[PDB]
């Protein structure tokens, strides 16, 4: 609640392992690159070096656990994602009218990205179509999921 | 660019996918499976950050084109575009 | 990053340089030499666009770091940072 | 005044020449790359292809004069640069107090960027130091140059 809980530190150590592939105790630009790309991002070599340099204490060119904590301490604060999620839905609002039909939602979700099964799409629509009119007012639906 | 558009459609579909799955697993279930929530939160941040990456590349592309336009306009003060 | 900072200082000094020269050549002279104004307008847009490029790269760098922080935070909803 | 003047078109043709190095009548990604870098920018190969594709009519992979006009037509509008110029000065406002001394201005302008001579610096300071106190209130000075 106040910048720290021995429980967080524990989890953050588990996090370090998500980065330190060889668990050699340090994160290199090569390991950081692999993780960033596993998240669908594509940092250049200089950008990887800059991420490390930003919190490179002993300037050895790599990040160790202690340094992996100043980077977090500096940005513990979170903020709601409502507007960004609404914008993601708007990508599929063909006519820019604020609605996406139940049919268009199935067409998007069963074909794009990682996808949902038709049965998962039925469950999502059951919750999103509040009026039962086969249309999803997405600004309202996102407000409800993020409320 | 078709590649950038493609990045947007896939990433946006995934933001819908993971927002739904996080909501379902943290509000429409009797027993919250944190392991599942973590998995979907990882996929959620990945899709949100991919859309941010496309938006920043589009702002970069736009300023590169505005640089060409500004240079062309010199052939015509401190105003730009 | 020292390289990015260096890009900023040089580009910023050039925005000061060319803004001054455009002003001088278009307001503090008896006869406006357009050829000179064009030259300085080209150097002005180049410096302004270099500063925009650094700012966009810094926003990119910042979101890459926020992606690492978001992924680390999954080990701990729809909130991000 | 209204999207066009036969005089502009004339100048824009001179502009095309700033881009068409070999004057072969077309601008390639290679020529665009050379010009963009001459402006201190560093577009990637994909970014160069995207600039061309944005206004690639006959989809031949290059930009010809006619296409070089839709790109301009779409953004003839200009806007004032006051705030951006003020931000450039703020880079040298060491204490973030709104002022840069006449001495610090000489130190910056005779060392960084393309540089001004000490004599040019004297002329700039004469105009910028309105109060004669050896200090430049840069927000005021920029407002005066952009007014
Ligand atoms: Ca390692
Ligand atoms: Ca270090
Ligand atoms: Ca050519
Ligand atoms: Ca073409």
CA distance C63 to C73: 15
Structure tokens, A17? 């392992």
| Tokens linked to B34 | 């944190």
Helix axes D45-54, B34-73, angle to 10 degrees: 70
Side-chain-side CA neighbours of A67 within 13 Å: the count stands at: 18
From the candidate CATH numbers 2.40.100.20, 1.10.287.810, 1.10.238.10, 2.40.10.10, the one assigned to the domain spanning A81-143: 1.10.238.10
Residue A140, exposed/middle/buried by CB under 10 A (0-12, 13-18, 19+)? middle
Search chain C and give the residue with CA nearest D87.
Answer: C12
Burial C9-26, CB ≥16 within 10 A → b, else e: ebbbbbbbbbbbbbbbbb
Distance CA D83, CA B23 (A): 43
* Closest by CA position to A120, among listed B34, C78, B51, B19: B19
A102, A138, D107, D139 from A118: Cα distances, Å: 12, 19, 68, 60
D88 three-class SS? helix
What's the CA gap between C20 and D77, in Å, rounded? 24
Q: Do the chains contact at B61 and D47, CB–CB below 8 Å?
A: yes
In this complex, how many residue pairs, one in chain A and one in chain B, have their CB atoms less than 8 Å apart?
Answer: 78
Ligand number with the minimum distance to the CA of A27? 1
Gap between the Cα atoms of B60 and C55, Å rounded: 10
CA–CA separation, B2 vs B6, rounded Å? 6
Per-residue tokens: D134: 């050896």
Q: Measured between alpha carbons, how far is B29 from B31 in angstroms, rounded to an integer?
A: 6
Residue A142 is encoded by which pair of tokens? 């996102």
- Enter the resolution in angstroms: 1.6
Cβ-nearest to A12 among C66, C72, C79: C72
Assess contact for C52 and B63: CB atoms under 8 A.
yes
Would A1-80 and A81-143 be classified into the same CATH topology?
Answer: yes
CB A36, CB A43: distance < 8 Å: yes
Q: Which two tokens stand for residue D39?
A: 């402006």
Domain boundaries, chain D: 1-80, 81-143
Indicate which of B14, B20, B46, B58 best probes the interface with A, i.e. most A CBs within 10 Å of its own CB: B20
Three-state DSSP class for residue A26: coil
Distance from CA of A21 to the nearest CA of C (A): 14
Topology annotation, domain C1-81? Helix Hairpins (1.10.287)
C-beta atoms surrounding A88 within 10 Å: 24
Helix residue ranges per DSSP H, C1-81:
2-27, 34-73
Does B51 contact A87 at a Cβ distance shorter than 8 Å? yes
* φ and ψ at residue A132, rounded to 5 degrees: 70, 25
Measured CA to CA, the distance from residue D6 to residue B74 in angstroms comes to 16
Give contacts of C12 with chain D, Cβ < 8 Å. 88-89, 91-92, 112-113
Two structure tokens written together for A21: 């592939």
Residues 6+ apart with CB under 8 A from D9: none
Phi, psi angle pair for A64, to nearest 5°: -110, 160
Closest C-chain CA to A76? C81
Q: Residues near C18 by Cβ (< 8 Å), separated by ≥ 6?
A: C40, C41, C43, C44, C47
* Cα B64 to chain centroid, rounded: 20
C-beta of residue D34 within 8 angstroms of C-beta of residue B68 = no
Taking the C-alpha atoms of residue A66 and residue A84, their distance in angstroms, rounded to an integer, is: 33
Nearest to B61 by CA among D31, D11, D55, C2: D55
Burial of C48 (0-12, 13-18, 19+ CB in 10 A): buried
Write the DSSP assignment of B10-45 as a string of letters: HHHHHHHHHHHHHHHHHHS-SS--HHHHHHHHHHHH
CB-based contact D89 C16, cutoff 8 Å: yes
* Phi/psi of residue D63, nearest 5 degrees: -105, 130
Q: How was this structure determined?
A: X-ray
Q: Whose CA is closest to B49, among D15, A81, A137? A: A81
Which spans in chain D are helix H? 6-19, 29-38, 45-54, 67-73, 82-90, 102-109, 118-128, 138-146
User: Cα–Cα distance between B68 and C4 in angstroms, integer?
Assistant: 23
For residue B60, the Cα-to-chain-centroid distance in whole angstroms is: 14
b/e B40-55 (16+ beta carbons within 10 angstroms → b) = bbbbbbbbbbbbbbbe
CA distances from A109 to A113, A121, B44, C13 (A): 8, 7, 15, 51
- Which tokens go with B78? 């401190």
Q: How far apart are CA A98 and CA A140, in angstroms?
A: 10
CA dihedral C23, C26, C30, C31 (to 10 degrees): 140
Spell D66-79 as b/e; 16+ CB within 10 A means b: ebbeebbeeeeeee
Closest CA to A5 of C70, C67, C75, B40: C75
Q: Rounded distance, CA D95 to CA D103, Å?
A: 15
Asked if A80 lies within 8 A of C65 by C-beta distance, the reply is no
Contact check, Cβ <8 Å, B24/A123: yes
State the distance from the centre of ligand 4 to the C-alpha of D55, rounded, in angstroms. 7
Cα B43 to Cα A52, A128, B14, B46, C65, distances in angstroms: 24, 21, 8, 5, 17
The CATH superfamily holding the domain D1-80 is EF-hand (1.10.238.10)
């Amino acid at each position: 609640a106040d910048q720290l809980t021995e429980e967080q530190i524990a989890e953050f150590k588990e996090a370090f392992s998500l980065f330190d592939k060889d668990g050699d105790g340090t994160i290199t630009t090569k390991e950081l690159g692999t993780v960033m790309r596993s998240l669908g991002q594509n940092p250049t070599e200089a950008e990887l070096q800059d991420m490390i340099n930003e919190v490179d204490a002993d300037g050895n060119g790599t990040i160790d656990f202690p340094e992996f904590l100043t980077m977090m301490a500096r940005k513990m604060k979170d903020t709601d994602s409502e507007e960004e999620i609404r914008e993601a839905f708007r990508v599929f609002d063909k006519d820019g009218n604020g609605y996406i039909s139940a049919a268009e939602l199935r067409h998007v979700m069963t074909n794009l990205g990682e996808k949902l099964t038709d049965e998962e799409v039925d469950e999502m629509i059951r919750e999103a179509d509040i009026d039962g009119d086969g249309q999803v007012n997405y600004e309202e639906f996102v407000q409800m999921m993020t409320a | 660019d078709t590649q950038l558009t493609k990045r947007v459609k896939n990433a946006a579909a995934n933001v819908l996918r993971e927002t739904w799955l996080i909501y379902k697993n943290t509000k429409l279930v009797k027993k919250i499976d944190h392991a599942k929530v973590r998995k979907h939160q990882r996929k959620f941040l990945q899709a949100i950050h991919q859309l941010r990456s496309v938006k920043m590349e589009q702002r970069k592309l736009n300023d590169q084109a505005n640089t060409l336009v500004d240079l062309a306009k010199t052939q015509l003060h401190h105003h730009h575009h």
